[PDB]
Structures are given as structure tokens and as C-alpha cells.
């Protein structure tokens, strides 16, 4: 299983006596076992791209051939760990060495083999039964949140010949044996899957269930759906932390994966430091987010192969849990840094560059990346379902949208949560641009909204119309000063402000506003839109002659109502239950309808 190094021209190592090798296979080059891949092959010689520094590699050094291509190790212990872009546990390397450096040629198994896991068989299978790919034959009890379901690896099937009894097993033991055409396969709790291969599903389903994030903005106006794909701009002043924390803390997804691609050391430190300190209430208990999260960490000085591979390592981990029936939400911290790593490799390989220097296949790689997300029907007899969402960020040099990476991304993602920095300077958070942002799932979710909430859809339509009109009136106001202006336009301007102030704006550092349940979000908007319509009617039905209603009159007449509308955000879901909040909102509806009635 060994070959020999023939020569080194830099990061590229030429091997000899390596006839038995496949392209994009893996090799461990030299006495330090440097990680690399075989790209060009000719005769019994192979050209190896080494990810790490090649200094010290000699002619005649051994090269160990590893049959599997770049692959991710999938099994118990994946959760709570921080991995390199090529699936190397950073929390074990730093703790098994007592060093601060990642050793050159470091060889730490992705999942530790010294843990005795609590494994319970399905109790439905027997020796002699038939099992197919994707079937679940037992569950490992990792923690209080996520059960780690052990699936038969894809592309495997047969009759069960051995089932391990209930007990404590580590990842090096044999749990299930199966025979296909006389060939017995011994399976442990860990499966290996090539990272560039898409894990098969029974069928790819439409995405219809909303992604219930905790923000009123980026939900009511710009919905995301489980299995959908969005893009988020990544600029220093955009306030991207709000989405990252809100998505990982309060989302209705089951498993969170955070993928770094190649960020600044201090930025990776902030993510690695913040995440372990985040908690959420679950069954009434406060649990660490890291019990249902996995994270891949890559800084700008990591091997370019890892920075390029990180994006596929993350989604492979995402699909792994997707096949368990979980809803998985993956965030790529910067897909632009990934594209930078990809362009670097194309340069290293002396490939012909295309648009703005990027590889000709940039679009194909991004398109096949996002196509892997979505709601699916899983493999295996359990007839379970799950989904993967992608909320990858883009950060092109200069902040422009002309860069092929951002242009290609926007043509692929169906939701764009355009953020802005001007809003941050005005201290308005979340910093959502509104006019640039869009969501293309509005129709896909129409069935859900009709079934459960009914009035949400006309409300979001009116809400966007009101906000857009405020923008359209901007020129009139600048040239007029609200003097030669319709009273109906004053309603639009001031109500649109009310929306921006006491609905779209949300203060996540307050205990009452940490999470806004959907029923509260639609309650808040319903009363604001109901007021809008009442105010429009109050003016329009009386605007003929003699005795007319104006906005100044409305403000003076029912000032207590405008206060009550602003106060609605303070209804703390932790203390005031669903019935109480709706009851108070119903009272505002009555107070309003009567207030306008007194004007006619």
C-alpha cells in the first residue's frame, strides 16, 4: 500500500511506483504523513498536490495510498466538535498535544475511539432479516437534545447476520454484520462518505414549512422555508451577528452547523468563543447550544485545500443528519472566501481563468452546492423526512455586486436578506435594507399560511405597499415639507414610521424581545394594518367638504391608541401566554374601531 516519492517541485510532489491509484484519491506523503491528493496520473507515476508545507520531503520517501477520496467520517461524537476544513478535530489536536499549533502532518482520527457510547438497537431487527441502505438499526444516546441514529451506509444492503446486544460500544467495534451474495460486511458506528458525492434520498420534496426565526423582520416580510437557500451580505457593520445568533438559538431546526471557509483569525476566535457561551431553553432547562451544533473552523492561513473543501465538508455533515430525519440549518460564514480559495487552487494548477480571474466552473460549483439543500424523503424503511437549509453569506471585495461570486450566488438563492450599514449607523437593528431584500418562497408558503393563520398574506402585501409608498413619497416630502401633501399620504408616512419603529425594529438584548413567536408577529402587524385602513377610511369618507378628518385630528383624538400600538412589542411571551397576548391585542382592535367610530 506504499509508493515512493520521485520528486518535489514545490507544493506538488511526483510519486513513482504508484500504479494502483485513482484520481482524487488520498495519499499521506513522507515520514510526517502529509495530506494530499492525486490529480494527474501517467504510467506508474502520479502527481500529488500536497495541502501542507512540503519542506523536508526527500526523494525516496514513502507515500501511503488511502483508497478513499476526500471523505468525511460520520458517526457518534460528531456533535460538539470543531473541525478543520478537511475533518480534523481541532479541540482534540490542541488537547492531545498541549501545543498551540496544528502539527504538520497531524493525524488525529475525526471521531475519537476511546469513548464508550450508549448504543440501543432498534429492537425490531433480527438475525436473518432484510436491511437496505438508509435503514436505522440502532440509536446512540449522545445528549439530552439530539439522538444520533445509526444508519446503514448508502450503497449497502443484505441479510443481517449479527446484531450487537444493548451495551456500551466504542467507534472501533462491530455493531452490525450483514451478508450480500455470500459477502459479509462488518460495520461499526462510523461510516465514510466521499465529501464531493451527494448522499442519495428517496425523493426531493417541495419546501413548504417556514423557517421560524426569532426576528419579526426577515420573517414577516422576507420568509425563509425549511430546505430553502438564502444569501446574507457580510460586511463589518451589517450586524450579521443578529442572524447567526437568532438562527442558532431559537430556530425550529434541530441541528445547527456553522461553516467557516477562510476568515480572519480574530473573526474565527469570536465565533469559536461566542458559540460555546450561547444557550437556549428547551424542555424548561437551559442547555448549551453546542449540544446540538457542529462547527467547522478555517482561518485564512489554513491549507487552501481545506478552505476550499470546508464548504463541502459542512454540507456533507449537514446531509448526514438530514438522513436521520432532522431539520438542519447550515451557515457558511463567507462563501466569497471559499471562492477565493477555489480561485487560488485554479491558479496553483495553472488552469485557464475566466470572469474576473475566477475559474470557468465557478458557477457550476456554486450551483451544485446549493442544489444539495432542500426538503427530502429519506432513505430506509423508517419513512422519515428532513431538510437542509443554507444561509450562506457573501462578502465580495469592495462590497460590489458585480463580482461573479455574488452575482452567481444571487441567481441561485431564492431569498436575499440584504443587510445595510447605514441602518446600523442609525442604530436600527436588525439592519435590513427592505428595498433590496426579497423572498421567492411567498407562494410556496401560501398553503401553510392559509391553513394556520389566514390573515398573514394580505397583511404582508399591504405592509410592503405601505413601506414602498413611504419611499415613493420621499421626493414629494423633500420638495414640500409635508405642507402641500395629502392627509392620506401623511397617514402612510407616519404609519410606515410606526412599522419601522415598533415592528420591523427588534431589540434582542431585552428579555421580552429575545424571541417573537409568529402569532405575536402577525398580531402586531394585524393591528397596525387594521389601524392604517381605519385611518385611510376616516379621512377618505369625510374628505368631501364641510367637516373633514385630518391626520393631526386623529393624533389628537386617539393619542392613547397610537401609544397602545407602540406598546404591543412589550408583551413578553415568557410571562404573558398565547391566550393573554391575543386577548390584549383583541382589546386594542376594539379600542381602535370605537375610537374611529366616534369621529363619524
Amino acid at each position: 500500500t506504499f509508493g515512493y516519492v520521485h520528486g518535489v517541485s514545490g507544493p506538488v510532489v511526483t510519486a513513482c511506483d504508484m500504479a494502483g491509484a485513482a484520481m482524487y484519491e488520498l495519499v499521506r506523503v513522507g515520514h510526517s504523513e502529509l495530506v494530499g491528493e492525486i490529480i494527474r496520473l501517467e504510467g506508474d507515476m502520479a502527481t500529488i498536490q500536497v495541502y501542507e508545507e512540503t519542506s523536508g520531503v526527500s526523494v525516496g520517501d514513502p507515500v501511503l495510498r488511502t483508497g478513499k477520496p476526500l471523505s468525511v467520517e460520520l458517526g457518534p461524537g460528531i456533535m460538539g466538535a470543531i473541525f478543520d476544513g478537511i475533518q480534523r478535530p481541532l479541540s482534540d489536536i490542541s488537547s492531545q498535544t498541549q501545543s498551540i499549533y496544528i502539527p504538520r502532518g497531524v493525524n488525529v482520527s475525526a471521531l475519537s475511539r476511546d469513548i464508550k457510547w450508549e448504543f440501543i438497537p432498534s429492537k425490531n431487527l433480527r438475525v436473518g432479516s432484510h436491511i437496505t441502505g438508509g435503514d436505522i438499526y440502532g440509536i446512540v444516546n449522545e445528549n439530552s437534545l439530539i439522538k444520533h441514529k445509526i444508519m446503514l451506509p448508502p450503497r449497502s444492503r443484505g441479510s443481517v447476520t449479527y446484531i450487537a446486544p444493548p451495551g456500551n460500544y466504542d467507534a472501533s467495534d462491530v455493531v452490525l454484520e450483514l451478508e450480500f451474495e455470500g459477502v459479509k460486511e462488518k460495520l461499526s458506528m462510523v461510516q465514510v462518505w466521499p465529501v464531493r458525492q451527494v448522499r442519495p434520498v428517496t425523493e426531493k420534496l417541495p419546501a413548504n414549512h417556514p423557517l421560524l426565526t426569532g426576528q419579526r423582520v426577515l420573517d414577516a416580510l422576507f420568509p425563509c422555508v425549511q430546505g430553502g437557500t438564502t444569501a446574507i451580505p457580510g460586511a463589518f457593520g451589517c450586524g450579521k451577528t443578529v442572524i447567526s445568533q437568532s438562527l442558532s438559538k431559537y430556530s425550529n431546526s434541530d441541528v445547527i452547523i456553522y461553516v467557516g471557509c477562510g476568515e480572519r483569525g480574530n473573526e474565527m476566535s469570536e465565533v469559536l468563543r461566542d458559540f460555546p457561551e450561547l444557550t437556549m431553553e428547551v424542555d424548561g432547562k437551559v442547555e448549551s447550544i453546542m449540544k446540538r451544533t457542529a462547527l467547522v473552523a478555517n482561518t485564512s492561513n489554513m491549507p487552501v485545500a481545506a478552505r476550499e473543501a470546508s464548504i463541502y465538508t459542512g454540507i456533507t455533515l449537514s446531509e448526514y443528519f438530514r438522513d436521520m430525519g432532522y431539520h438542519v440549518s447550515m451557515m457558511a460564514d463567507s462563501t466569497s472566501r471559499w471562492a477565493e480559495a477555489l480561485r487560488e487552487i485554479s491558479g496553483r494548477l495553472a488552469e485557464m481563468p475566466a470572469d474576473s480571474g475566477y475559474p470557468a466552473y465557478l458557477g457550476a460549483r456554486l450551483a451544485s452546492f446549493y442544489e444539495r439543500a432542500g426538503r427530502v424523503k429519506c432513505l430506509g424503511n423508517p419513512e422519515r423526512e428532513g431538510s437542509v437549509s443554507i444561509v450562506g453569506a457573501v462578502s465580495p471585495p469592495g462590497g460590489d455586486f458585480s463580482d461573479p461570486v455574488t452575482s452567481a450566488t444571487l441567481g441561485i438563492v431564492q431569498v436575499f436578506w440584504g443587510l445595510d450599514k447605514k441602518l446600523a449607523q442609525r442604530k436600527h437593528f436588525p439592519s435590513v435594507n427592505w428595498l433590496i431584500s426579497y423572498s421567492k418562497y411567498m407562494r410556496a408558503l401560501d398553503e401553510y399560511y392559509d391553513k394556520h393563520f389566514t390573515e398573514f398574506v394580505p397583511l404582508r402585501t399591504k405592509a410592503k405597499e405601505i413601506l414602498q409608498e413611504e419611499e415613493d413619497l420621499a421626493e414629494i416630502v423633500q420638495l414640500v415639507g409635508k405642507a402641500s401633501l395629502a392627509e392620506t399620504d401623511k397617514i402612510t408616512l407616519e404609519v410606515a414610521k410606526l412599522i419601522k419603529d415598533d415592528f420591523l425594529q427588534q431589540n434582542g438584548y431585552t428579555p421580552y424581545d429575545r424571541f417573537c413567536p409568529f402569532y405575536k408577529t402577525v398580531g402586531m402587524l394585524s393591528n397596525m394594518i387594521s389601524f392604517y385602513d381605519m385611518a385611510r377610511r376616516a379621512v377618505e369618507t369625510t374628505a368631501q367638504s364641510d367637516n373633514k378628518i385630518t391626520w393631526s385630528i386623529i393624533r389628537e383624538h386617539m393619542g392613547e391608541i397610537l401609544y397602545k400600538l407602540s406598546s404591543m412589542k412589550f408583551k413578553d411571551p415568557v410571562k404573558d401566554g398565547e391566550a393573554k397576548i391575543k386577548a390584549d391585542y383583541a382589546q386594542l382592535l376594539e379600542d381602535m374601531q370605537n375610537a374611529f367610530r366616534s369621529l363619524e
Binding site: 500504479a19 494502483g20 491509484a21 485513482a22 484520481m23 482524487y24 494527474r40 496520473l41 501517467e42 504510467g43 506508474d44 477520496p69 464531493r196 451527494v198 426531493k204 417541495p206 488552469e351 485557464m352 481563468p353 475566466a354 470572469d355 470557468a360 466552473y361 458557477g363 457550476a364 450551483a367 451544485s368 446549493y370 442544489e371 444539495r372 432542500g374 458585480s402 452575482s407 444571487l410 441567481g411 441561485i412
Partner: protein, 459 residues
């Protein structure tokens, strides 16, 4: 036929990108297809793009990941990619390689046709002289479609070009006041786009005349440059051997161009613009020119090679080279879409290079050409008025300018705006044209002769 046993080789010399180089091959044939088996049993195929002596260069469609050097087994079919074709492919769904994906059987061939096809003898090609009624005023009026014409829709990411193509599939008829077989090549698209069209074709109740070829974003990028030829090969069988009128729609051709660019870079070919091969035009003609009527046969092929314009750049090689080959384009833009105008078709940069012969006495109405030309003049001037007014202000305009601003505003909402299910006739479209033209006094309608104004303008 080929009666001699096929040879199998384990003589792979080396692998370089997408190209597997074999040695020790007996009498290599250029552009022959090779089937190869990987050590794990995976089957893949490729085509010999170069032969020299005992060597041959095989481009593998599925990809070269996992290709070995010692255990790889290849066999030479002994011919070019000839594919099975039959009439009953209508109602079937295929992948980008020509294989069924609808749980039905493989094709029970009536013949085997060369995927590369043959050029039609220009002496027997018959000039198109029939009009298709698309029902879209923006097209039937000012940019008519002939049967056998090549008209892509130039679009941009996020615009409803897929909805327009779907609409055209249902309400495309004749102006002779007819069932088109539709071949839809869904390449480089996501599941939702392919499911959108598949569902629409069933919703329209026309699936019995629809053949689908799917090649999705998560499928190999090399197969994406044979799928169009697979679709067209079926179209040629149906149109020229079975006298069926066929409508062939190729989804974002830009995914074809990008797949082609990948091959060009892999083979280190001479680039032209933006990294695309210097022979991109010839390759596009091989795809596009498989269209039109042939004298003595009652079939036809009409193409709609819709393409996405990268960064809305109308001069990008993809729309540029296509524009040089096809008989014009429909062209949609974001300025209309951003105002909720559907279909968002911008007539000014558009043209139909057969319209001049497919309209008029005996085809539609004698004033057709005159109405179209004057509408173009009025629309373009109205755009010029906005370009001026943006700087000088509305107060700086005279009555000669306001007429074009009134025309432009009423034109877009009355003539262009229709809705996904608004099917207008060509005669109604011209009548609408006159409703807009009557905004101006006769003296300003300088593109129309008095022999036409005197009859139609008074109403």
C-alpha cells in the same frame, strides 16, 4: 451494422483533468464512444476527441473522479454516439444522457441517428412562410414568430423567463383564421425549475406531446453539452421523418456555454472572449441551425434557446454569439420586471429577422408592418424623452415631447402588460396598436404611408 466483437482494454496511459488517455489501442477511431468500468463497478462513458498512433484521448461524461490507471477497463463501441429514437418518446422523461428517468423502459428504437447530425442542404431548405400566434402582443405584433424560426428569449437571473416559455407552450397557435410536439431540454437548472415545467406541461393537458430531457445543476457538466443534441436529434426524427411540427426549447443556454468553456479550458484550446473557445460560434451553430422547414415535407422545427445574460451584459459572448446566429431575440429586462409588468419584454433592443415576410396581406392584416414600425419609433422616442426629462425637468418639455411620454406610459400598460393567462389575437394586437398610435396627429406618424393612415387612423 457492426458485426465484429468489441475490444476491451486495460491500457490507460494516464489521466489529466477530464481526459483519460489510452495507449496500445488498435486502429483508434475519431469521435467514437468508449464505455469504461471503474474498480468498484461504476459504469461511465466518454468520447474520443483525439487519436494519434496507438493513443486515444477519451473525455469522460460522468467525470474522472475514481478513474484508476491499472484496473480501469474500457471498451470501444466502434461507432459515434448514435442514439435510439422513436416516435413514442413523446410522453417520456429522459435525463441529460438520453436515459429514461420516468420508471419506464429504455427506448425501443425505430432507428439510430448520429447525435452530431448533418447539415441540411441549403438548396432543399425552404424559407419559412408561416406565422405562429404566441398570444403575446409584445411578440405577435412587433416581433412575430415564424414556424421554423429561431428566437431565444434573452433574460437575466431572477426574471420570469421560465414562466414566459411555459405560457408560450400552451397558447402558441396559428394565425390562419394544430398540435405542436414540444421537446424541452432542462439543463443546468434546479429541481424547482424542472418541476415547474413538468407540472405545467401536465396542467396544460398536453403531456402526451411533450418529451423532457433533464440535466440538473447537480448532474455532470460534461453531459450538459450533448443534451441539446439529444433533444434536437429527437426533434429531427419527429419533424423530418414523421412530419410532426416540433417546438424545441433549450433552457438557459448559458449553462451549455459554461460547460463548453470548461471543456475548452481542459483541452487548452485558443480562447476568444471571456475565456470561451474561439470555436464557440461554430459549436453554437451546430446546435442552433437544426431548425427550419425542408421543401417537400410537412414538418418543421422551431427553437426557443432561452439564455440568461451574465450580469445583464448584452455584449457577453453568450448573447452576442447567439444574436449573430438566431433570427433575433425577445429580450426581457429588469426595468419592466421591477414594476410588476408581465410579460417584462422590452421591444426596443429586440427584433425578428423573418417578421418582414411573415406578416401582411395573406398572413395577418395589410397594415401589420406599418403599425409595428411606427410603434417602434414612438416607443424609442418616448424613452429619449425620459432620458432628457430626467435632467431638464418636466417643465422644460413641450407638447411635442408630452405626446411621447403619454404614449410610452400608455404603451407599456395597455400593449405590453397582459398577464400569464391573457391570450390576445394578432388582430386585436394591431387594433390595440392603433389605439396607442391615435395618441399622435397624422403628421407625426412618419413611418406610415398615407395609403394606410387614411383607412385605419380615423377609427
Amino acid at each position: 451494422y457492426l458485426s465484429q466483437p468489441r475490444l476491451t482494454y486495460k491500457t490507460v496511459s494516464g489521466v489529466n483533468g477530464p481526459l483519460v488517455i489510452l495507449d496500445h489501442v488498435k486502429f483508434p477511431r475519431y469521435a467514437e464512444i468508449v464505455h469504461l468500468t471503474l474498480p468498484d463497478g461504476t459504469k461511465r462513458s466518454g468520447q474520443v476527441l483525439e487519436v494519434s498512433g496507438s493513443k486515444a484521448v477519451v473525455q469522460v461524461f460522468e467525470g474522472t473522479s475514481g478513474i484508476d490507471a491499472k484496473k480501469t477497463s474500457c471498451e470501444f463501441t466502434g461507432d459515434i454516439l448514435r442514439t435510439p429514437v422513436s416516435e413514442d418518446m413523446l410522453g417520456r422523461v429522459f435525463n441529460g444522457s438520453g436515459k429514461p428517468i420516468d420508471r419506464g423502459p429504455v427506448v425501443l428504437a425505430e432507428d439510430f441517428l448520429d447525435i452530431m447530425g448533418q447539415p441540411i442542404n441549403p438548396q432543399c431548405r425552404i424559407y419559412p412562410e408561416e406565422m405562429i400566434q404566441t398570444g403575446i402582443s409584445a411578440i405577435d405584433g412587433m416581433n412575430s414568430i415564424a414556424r421554423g424560426q429561431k428566437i431565444p428569449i434573452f433574460s437575466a437571473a431572477g426574471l420570469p423567463h421560465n414562466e414566459i416559455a411555459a405560457q408560450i407552450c400552451r397558447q402558441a397557435g396559428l394565425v390562419k383564421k394544430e398540435n405542436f410536439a414540444i421537446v424541452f431540454a432542462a439543463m443546468g437548472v434546479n429541481m424547482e425549475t424542472a418541476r415547474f415545467f413538468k407540472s405545467d406541461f401536465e396542467e396544460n393537458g398536453s403531456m402526451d406531446n411533450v418529451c423532457l430531457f433533464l440535466n440538473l445543476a447537480n448532474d455532470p457538466t460534461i453531459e450538459r453539452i450533448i443534451t441539446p443534441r439529444l433533444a434536437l436529434t429527437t426533434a429531427e426524427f419527429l419533424a423530418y421523418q414523421c412530419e410532426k411540427h416540433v417546438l424545441v426549447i433549450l433552457t438557459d443556454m448559458s449553462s451549455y456555454a459554461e460547460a463548453l468553456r470548461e471543456v475548452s479550458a481542459a483541452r487548452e484550446e485558443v480562447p476568444g472572449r471571456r475565456g470561451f473557445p474561439g470555436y464557440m460560434y461554430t459549436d453554437l451553430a451546430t446546435i442552433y441551425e437544426r431548425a427550419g422547414r425542408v421543401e417537400g415535407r410537412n414538418g418543421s422545427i422551431t427553437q426557443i434557446p432561452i439564455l440568461t445574460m451574465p450580469n445583464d451584459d448584452i455584449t457577453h459572448p453568450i448573447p452576442d454569439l447567439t444574436g449573430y446566429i438566431t433570427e433575433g431575440q425577445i429580450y426581457v429586462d429588469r426595468q419592466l420586471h421591477n414594476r410588476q409588468i408581465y410579460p417584462p419584454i422590452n421591444v426596443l433592443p429586440s427584433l425578428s429577422r423573418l417578421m418582414k415576410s411573415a406578416i401582411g396581406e395573406g398572413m395577418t392584416r395589410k397594415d401589420h408592418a406599418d403599425v409595428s414600425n411606427q410603434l417602434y419609433a414612438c416607443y424609442a422616442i418616448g424613452k429619449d424623452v425620459q432620458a432628457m426629462k430626467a435632467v431638464v425637468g418636466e417643465e422644460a418639455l413641450t407638447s411635442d415631447d408630452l405626446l411621447y411620454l403619454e404614449f410610452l406610459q400608455k404603451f407599456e400598460k395597455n400593449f405590453i402588460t397582459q398577464g400569464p393567462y391573457e391570450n390576445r389575437t394578432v388582430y386585436e394586437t394591431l387594433d390595440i396598436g392603433w389605439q396607442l398610435l391615435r395618441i399622435f396627429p397624422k403628421e407625426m406618424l412618419k413611418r406610415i404611408p398615407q395609403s394606410t393612415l387614411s383607412e385605419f387612423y380615423p377609427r
